[PDB]
């Protein structure tokens, strides 16, 4: 059936502990406000040195380090290579984004919220996407002191994880609640401890 | 740094002289949508949803990698054979869920700041090498053009468990053992 594409790379000018020589090519697409602001940046990288790039905002290949003038000047002289790279803003970025609307951007994994111990740890695990709001409430009062939160933890399996800690001195009748808001949740999850 | 609501890498293309070896993958919002098995010429999507509704021709990946092989040789010569610099990777071990005895869980070993992308990530159970129930992500790209890779250890939490993530990399003097604190 029909297949999506990636960035087609340009060919370099040449004709034709253990040491290692590494090459990377990154066809990168940036999206903002849906399909209202799209930007293509293809990156040519030797080891860790990005030496030549195409920026759709610029429209031509540009050299980044003294290693890229021969590549950038040659790719810009090839009319079809330059035109096809510009058109990848449509054939790659804008096209594949429409397939993300059908799949990735509709993926909703509800988070699992648990509390355990003084210090109270609210574990918010296995959620997607990466937009989340975790707040501690003591007797219907949002805690705003002594709340240390770990950074957003990427599990690498299309789920995220975050742990919010609350240093609390428990008292008679004190009910502590972890509030979690997430796009997959019509109402925020509230978990009490007391 | 480009600010955007979503970032996709429709083409993380990798090729290196050691091996030699390569990698082709697409990423969206920092996660791997698929990689292409260059030896078996197969696209391997990472979610069931992708396997049912998304399609990518492996020949496009094989062709791009062949260009990378040619571009690498050219820039090796242009740079006076300037070799890659070995970075020191940083290793972090944590669990996917809060750990409860008898409830099957997963240990996650994040190996960050990898370069060159040649690494050996293995697990140890009480000093014994774990060879089964282990999986791994591809090399995932970073904006500084290094990589990170995540290894998964499925385990049944028990009282007498000692798990370590052993990482071997040229940037390390010795193999790095990262013991998992039960937390």
């Amino acid at each position, epitope marked *: 059936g029909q297949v999506e594409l990636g960035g087609g790379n340009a060919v370099e000018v040449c*004709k034709g502990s253990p040491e290692d020589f590494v090459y990377q090519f990154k066809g990168m697409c940036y999206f903002t406000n849906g399909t209202e602001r799209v930007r293509l940046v293809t990156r040519y990288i030797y080891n860790r040195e990005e030496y030549a790039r195409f920026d759709s905002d610029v429209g031509v290949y540009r050299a980044v380090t003294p290693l890229g003038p021969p590549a950038a000047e040659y790719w810009n002289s090839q009319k*079809e290579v330059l035109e096809r790279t510009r058109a990848e803003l449509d054939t790659v970025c804008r096209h594949n984004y429409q397939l993300e609307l059908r799949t990735t951007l509709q993926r909703r994994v509800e988070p699992t919220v648990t509390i355990s111990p003084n210090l109270l740890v609210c574990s918010v695990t296995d959620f997607y996407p990466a937009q989340i709001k975790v707040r501690w409430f003591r007797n219907d009062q949002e805690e705003t002191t002594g709340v240390v939160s770990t950074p957003l933890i990427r599990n690498g399996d299309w789920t995220f994880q975050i742990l919010v800690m609350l240093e609390m001195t428990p008292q008679r009748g004190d009910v502590y609640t972890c509030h979690v808001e997430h796009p997959s949740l019509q109402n925020p999850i509230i978990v009490e401890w007391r | 740094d480009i600010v955007a609501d979503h970032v996709a890498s429709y083409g993380v293309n990798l090729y290196q002289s050691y091996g030699p070896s390569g990698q082709y993958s697409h990423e969206f919002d920092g996660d791997e949508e698929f990689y292409v098995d260059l030896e078996r010429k197969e696209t391997v999507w990472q979610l069931p949803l992708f396997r049912r509704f998304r399609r990518f021709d492996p*020949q496009f990946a094989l062709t791009n990698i062949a260009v990378l092989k040619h571009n690498l040789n050219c820039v090796i010569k242009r740079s006076n054979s300037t070799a890659a610099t070995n970075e020191v990777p940083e290793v972090t071990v944590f669990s996917k869920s809060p750990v409860t005895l008898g409830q099957p869980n997963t240990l996650i070993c994040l190996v960050d700041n990898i370069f060159p992308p040649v690494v050996n990530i293995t697990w140890l159970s009480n000093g014994h090498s774990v060879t089964e129930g282990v999986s791994e992500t591809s090399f995932l790209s970073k904006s500084d053009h290094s990589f990170f890779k995540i290894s998964y250890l499925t385990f049944l939490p028990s009282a007498d468990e000692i798990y370590d993530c052993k990482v071997e990399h040229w940037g390390l003097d010795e193999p790095l053992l990262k013991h998992w604190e039960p937390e």
Partner: T-cell receptor, first 112, second 111 residues
């Protein structure tokens, strides 16, 4: 194949030829290519386009807004333009990604 | 442009034929086609970096090869009368760029 064309078409010499092509199942990552073949010669590339209109020394290419059809405009048709004109969608399909599959085309006869 | 030899060939049934193609200078992708009055212009196979990529629907008798200089050869084994055709070679700068055809090799298989 994704393109259909009228089998034959006549054009008066010195007029412009407007050869139509339909391709409703075209994808957003597929280009439209036009070739021709005079007699027993190798096929000749004419022009290609994605969405915009294109013009080179040989012809213009008009792709409709919905991209479901296109038209090749040959200016000042001469006897040397008598050929079979092939409208080809360079498909993005598994196992044939980037292929140029030739159809029956349009036999253009430039009448003096 | 694309150079193709031999221009005209005469073979008998059961023989083999090798067709040579020199792409446009700098071009690295090469594609082969067979043109008959019956089947029309039919795609054989495509080469880049010395390896076959996309392939048409022809039997194993039709094989090809590409050298490190991007020149390509094509071979037909156990020739049949229906193999008489125009055999066209086309090249493009990269795989996926505009392909430009040569003039072809005219093969006649005779009894």
């Amino acid at each position: 194949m994704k393109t259909t064309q009228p089998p034959s078409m006549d054009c008066a010499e010195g007029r412009a030829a407007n050869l139509p092509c339909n391709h409703s199942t075209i994808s957003g990552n597929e280009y439209v290519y036009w070739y021709r073949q005079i007699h027993s010669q190798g096929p000749q590339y004419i022009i290609h386009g994605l969405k915009n209109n294109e013009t080179n020394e040989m012809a213009s290419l008009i792709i409709t807004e919905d991209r479901k059809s296109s038209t090749l405009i040959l200016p000042h048709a001469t006897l040397r333009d008598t050929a079979v004109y092939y409208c080809i969608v360079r498909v993005a399909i598994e196992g044939s990604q980037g292929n140029l599959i030739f159809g029956k085309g349009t036999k253009l006869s430039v009448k003096p | 442009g694309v150079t193709q030899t031999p221009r005209y060939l005469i073979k008998t049934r059961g023989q083999q034929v090798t067709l040579s193609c020199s792409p446009i200078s700098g071009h690295r992708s090469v594609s082969w086609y067979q043109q008959t009055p019956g089947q029309g212009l039919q795609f054989l196979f495509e080469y880049f970096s010395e390896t076959q990529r996309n392939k048409g629907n022809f039997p194993g008798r039709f094989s090809g090869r590409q050298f490190s200089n991007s020149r390509s050869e094509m071979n037909v084994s156990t020739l049949e009368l229906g193999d008489s055709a125009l055999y066209l070679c086309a090249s493009s700068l990269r795989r996926g760029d505009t392909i430009y055809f040569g003039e072809g090799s005219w093969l006649t298989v005779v009894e």
